[PDB]
Symmetry: D2
Subunit: 336 residues, 4 copies
Amino acid sequence: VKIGINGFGRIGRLAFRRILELGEKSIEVVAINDLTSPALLAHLLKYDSTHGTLNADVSATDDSIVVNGKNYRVYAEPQAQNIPWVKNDGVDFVLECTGFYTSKAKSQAHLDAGAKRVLISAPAGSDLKTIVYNVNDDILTADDRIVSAGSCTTNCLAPLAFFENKEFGIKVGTMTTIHAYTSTQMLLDGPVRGGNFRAARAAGVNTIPHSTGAAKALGLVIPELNGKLQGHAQRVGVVDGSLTELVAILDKKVTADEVNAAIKKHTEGNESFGYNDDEIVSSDVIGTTFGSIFDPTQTEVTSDGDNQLVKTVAWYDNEYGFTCQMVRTLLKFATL
Amino acid sequence: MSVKIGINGFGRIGRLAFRRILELGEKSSDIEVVAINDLTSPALLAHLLKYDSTHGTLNADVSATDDSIVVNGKNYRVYAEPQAQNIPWVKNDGVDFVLECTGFYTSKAKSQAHLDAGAKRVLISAPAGSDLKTIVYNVNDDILTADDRIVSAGSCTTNCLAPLAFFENKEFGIKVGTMTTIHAYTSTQMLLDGPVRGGNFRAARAAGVNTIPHSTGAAKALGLVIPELNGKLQGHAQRVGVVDGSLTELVAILDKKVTADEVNAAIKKHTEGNESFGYNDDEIVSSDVIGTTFGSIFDPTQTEVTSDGDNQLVKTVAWYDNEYGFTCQMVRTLLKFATL
Amino acid sequence: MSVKIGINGFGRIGRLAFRRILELGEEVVAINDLTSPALLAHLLKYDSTHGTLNADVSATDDSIVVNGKNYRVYAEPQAQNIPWVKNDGVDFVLECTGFYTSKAKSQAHLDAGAKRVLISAGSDLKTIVYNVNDDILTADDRIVSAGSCTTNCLAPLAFFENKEFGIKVGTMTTIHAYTSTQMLLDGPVRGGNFRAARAAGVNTIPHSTGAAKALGLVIPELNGKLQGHAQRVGVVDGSLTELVAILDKKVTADEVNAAIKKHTEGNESFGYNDDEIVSSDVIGTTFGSIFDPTQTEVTSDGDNQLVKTVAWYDNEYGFTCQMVRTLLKFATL
Amino acid sequence: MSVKIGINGFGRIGRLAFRRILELEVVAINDLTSPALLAHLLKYDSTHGTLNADVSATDDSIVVNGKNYRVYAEPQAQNIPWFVLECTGFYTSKAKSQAHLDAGAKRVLISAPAGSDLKTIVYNVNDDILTADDRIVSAGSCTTNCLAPLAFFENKEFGIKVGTMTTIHAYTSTQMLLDGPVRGGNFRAARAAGVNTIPHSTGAAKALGLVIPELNGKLQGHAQRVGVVDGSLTELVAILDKKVTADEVNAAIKKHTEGNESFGYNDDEIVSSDVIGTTFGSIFDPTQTEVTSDGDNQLVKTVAWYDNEYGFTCQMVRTLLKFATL
Ligand SMILES: [Hg+2]
Ligand SMILES: [Hg+2]
Ligand SMILES: [Hg+2]
Ligand SMILES: [Hg+2]
Ligand SMILES: [Hg+2]
Ligand SMILES: [Hg+2]
Ligand SMILES: [Hg+2]
Ligand SMILES: [Hg+2]
Ligand SMILES: [Hg+2]
Ligand SMILES: [Hg+2]
């Protein structure tokens, strides 16, 4: 089970780390494609301000990265179709991390170059499947060649909305994610691509509203919720570690203790959707393997007569969590 | 014959109140601080009045004596009485009204002390129970009469949520709502993980490198300010890693079916020329509100209406300087004390 | 009677220059920039470091408006094509892009009508730190460097310390606010530097600087005598320099303090603060450098001595006010 | 049979010592805060992550991986039934720490500077001077454990005539989140830590004499507290007895790092984050070395990183273990 990684950004590198750890106890990466000198790439794989230092020997050569005596070639093709990693290296699936190949059409380029399947790490349209592992990965079939993992937010929200709706019937809901700052943001105020007024502001010293598609597109993952949710984000001054607040009108009348026990059930042995009642904070989830961690301590039911609002919340390592989700799906690709 | 204020407790709010009243003094409001009570050395207080990591350096000449703080050549005595009934500032200095921001006189019964020391009225910078009036300026200040000698300003959050909720209810009717305030870290929080007053596992965590959930009673208590919303709202807080500047999200079920443009138009009219409840549609972020004089600033760009047949959710958002805004609200209430 | 200023590059520094020129009140007439006027007006109006400009700011399709005055914004990628000489009568170009940074390349501005050009950060042109060596400017000068943000802090301290006591050798470390060149999270960066690649908000990060080494351009007696580097730390703005030196005179901290202090009297460029301030207190200050006597330390064991001195600076605002001071002089030579 | 540590004061350092000793002998704890909160803080940490063990509490004890650790609550240490690691900050004297000796403890290791009538030990610099009569030892400070080996080794190779240090240091517990009064009244201690670079006094260099006697009187320094939660670095600028080059200095210092668990080496161009959770008291970084000369006047700058919490604590443990051989 061999992976080629297109784009050795933060998610790309974390996928490397994750597959490496997994491989120590039982799929493997064989090649990477990226414009950066491998020397720097190796450095960024070894040292991480968020995730710590990789316990392994890392070096580079002029065309590769080396870990624990193994050589991982890095190509530098700006057009995916020219990546020779299939004949050259044995690549089965491509993890597509670049943000540039974000549609079925665009990613065909990988197929043209011989890859069996592709997993894109972002929303990539409605003409292919959007998978959140442990929610709708069962809909995968052998025919599925280009797939989308959705977003980091999708992977947190989906299971919460999924099970909440199955227990109680979500009529309508709104979401706010209080999200760590990201690479698309700036250190200091200044112009940015797209020209967005908020995109342009200093990430580390502001709370910054930000648009997401997560909720609005949730129907690609949970079709009965199409048209039922909207949301946005607030970008705040931490490096990593996020949380999502969902507020919904339900079909059923509930208490907070009832909501908590119902959802808890669905976290039992679930590697994608966890549970924590220790009153954690954001830092506590950095480096966790779940795509979403339900926090019963924040559950709130507001009612007067029989107008009811229910707020639930889940934590997530928007980096590491999302990535572990994508690796689960790469793995499910082998079984198709 | 100016309004004369005693400030009890020269902490962050006290100091800002001093600065605001000083600024108003320059184009005379006729309000002035004549005295302070605090147990910290005047030279440290003076240092903290002059320099501030959030709100900048005061453009005034500031120094200390061993019992006062001197500003632009005027002397402001700093009393040091741990018990408020002992502060001699009414007789010594002309104090009319006390601004009480210590956090220790947080009830009608406790603040009686100021009256016993001869203060005409007291404004408490915090929630202070239900046997006195809780006033949010420009929402319910019209309820004040001459018999009100001890008044509560509610909290910083109350001062943000109140007008939003008030005007939204007025226009559309709030059946039920919940709020989440995304809030700058505060004085009560810790720099690093460790034990804390009260024992709370969350309070105990490092504030600059975490998003920390936190309890609030602003929503639950809003009935004190807007009786019709009693028992209609709940909420909480997320403390985030900025020094100042906050926002509240309100999620409500309304009586009317609405659109976003409609909610926006309706709330907007109530911000116009409203010195307490402002408006900004320039797509601002939290630092843009640091230093603003509003108790709450409505942000139309974040409005959201979610609709699936008959069921509707409305989300509105307001920004505030949890320090400066709150404080300018209180100063407005003080000025209003003079009209009673 | 006035000399008309064009600004190439409306980045942080260029916008601060505008605010500074606006504030001095008793004049810019055009801008050149790649970014839409709307975003630029927004970034002029709002700032996470320096606050909200107290002026009416708005934008059009091809300009930004401040207090009823129109400031045309060209969008020419190539400096030689900017037409603000004819169109808007430009006399002087303030150049803050980073892409012209030599006599060679700033010649484009003169090719297009400009009298003089002020840049920031070679050797075939004068580097001017106002109130240290602006005297060397002459009418012959066409292109001049204001030096760097760091140079404008270090120059005056080093000049005056050397003047009074004689610097034999010295090393500096500037504990510096994070900058635009740095990154929010770990990843590849232009140049490829391993430390440049790291998360700036949550690390202390060593950084190469050239200010000490090039100080010779400003204070010829100090050429070859100083070295230094930076540590980039987690604040948006506000920085300090520590200079450690071997001096030709044996001294006490007070001797050093009193000596350096007289050079700050009425000095709008090199100030003095002994109130025990911290970095955020210098944000918004107009000095290129603010001596802090409270941090002065003399270490000695018998006749072997080291002297440590410290100055603070707003690396944004202080540097820019220095550029403004130079602009005022240059333009009217 | 094997050695039983008792920890007085379950603060950040005490807790990290607990964790480190578990990773590698502690049987009881004395702290005035509730076992539940202690438990939560042992399990979760913003800086050092979550403990990979199962932790719980009771009414009088902390439970980990099955084993149970009693938490006594005595404000007077004579009164703790139960070597002692003294982390409290309140027993900062040979005389004060006599209390733990009154309670029957063999030896006491104080995790702070504790005068000159006891020995201050930096493990792997001067731990050899310890003997069976020393019942109360100081481990000096976090900074002391970083500065010591660097200065010791540089001094032994080149001879320091005079030196000054600046440690660029993560913010600490004594500091505040927002501006306001603090105990002692210092104008700078009163200022918001997360958004300032803040000068702070230090005594580590002046006092280095207690660890390295030939350096007595030759060093001074200070700190700049900056906006990160952990991870620090020290710059030393010194006049030496010999002429050198940067390469020479690096080669010379590097050789004392070989197999040195207390003083390490890193030449990958790291940053503060990189040292968090590292086990060394100090890490030499040769990429930052600088020699400045004109004529025959020479200044030498060397730099070492450290985790001011984790390094210090791992240094302390190494000393606790050495107590045993004694
Ligand atoms: Hg990438
Ligand atoms: Hg979620
Ligand atoms: Hg991962
Ligand atoms: Hg609000
Ligand atoms: Hg105010
Ligand atoms: Hg410039
Ligand atoms: Hg300087
Ligand atoms: Hg300026
Ligand atoms: Hg050190
Ligand atoms: Hg440790």
